[PDB]
Design a protein around this nucleic acid. Structure first.
Length: 48
DNA sequence: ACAGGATGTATATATGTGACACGTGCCTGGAGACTAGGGAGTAATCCCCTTGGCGGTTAAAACGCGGGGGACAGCGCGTACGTGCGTTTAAGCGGTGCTAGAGCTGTCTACGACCAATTGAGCGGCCTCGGCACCGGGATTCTCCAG
C-alpha cells in the first residue's frame, strides 16, 4: 500500500496554516486545564 | 435445286440547331482634384450594481404508488383504389397572320429638395388618485360515486 500510493501525512494541515498552530497550542492547555471550547467560523468549508 | 430480280436495313455521308468563342463599339468604371461630415478616439458622468461564502424558510419539484383507461396489435371484412383496356378527346407541334401594346425617345414642366428662418408640438418631470388586484365571504355549479 505505502509503495502503491502516497497521501498527505496530516502534519502539513497544521504546518501550512499558522493560525492552526496557535489554535493547537491553545486547545492543548485548555484541555490540560479541563475546559471545553466552542470554535466559531463563518465558513462551513473551513469546518472540514 | 438454282440464278437472278424485288424488296429492307443497318451503314456511312452531307446537311440542320445550339452553344461556345471571337470580334467590334459605347457605355460604365476608372482615374483625379476638392470639400465637407462622419466617424474614430479619448475623456467625463451616472448608473446601481458587484461576489463568496453561508444561514434560513417556504413552496415548486421531486418521488411513490396505485390504477385505470388508453395505446397497440390482431381479426375481420367490405369497400375501394389501382390495374389494364378499349375509346375519343383534345393537347400540341407547326403553321399563318393581325394588332395591341411594350419599349423607347424626347420635352418640359411641376415637384421635390434644401434652407433659413420660426415656433409649437411633444417629450420628460412630477403629482395624484381611480382602477385593477386580492380578501372574504357566500352562494352556486360541476364532478363523482352510489345507488
Amino acid at each position: 500500500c505505502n509503495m502503491r500510493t502516497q497521501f498527505p501525512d496530516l502534519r502539513l494541515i497544521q504546518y501550512d496554516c499558522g493560525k492552526l498552530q496557535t489554535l493547537a497550542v491553545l486547545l492543548r492547555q485548555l484541555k490540560a486545564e479541563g475546559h471545553r471550547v466552542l470554535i466559531f467560523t463563518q465558513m462551513t468549508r473551513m469546518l472540514d
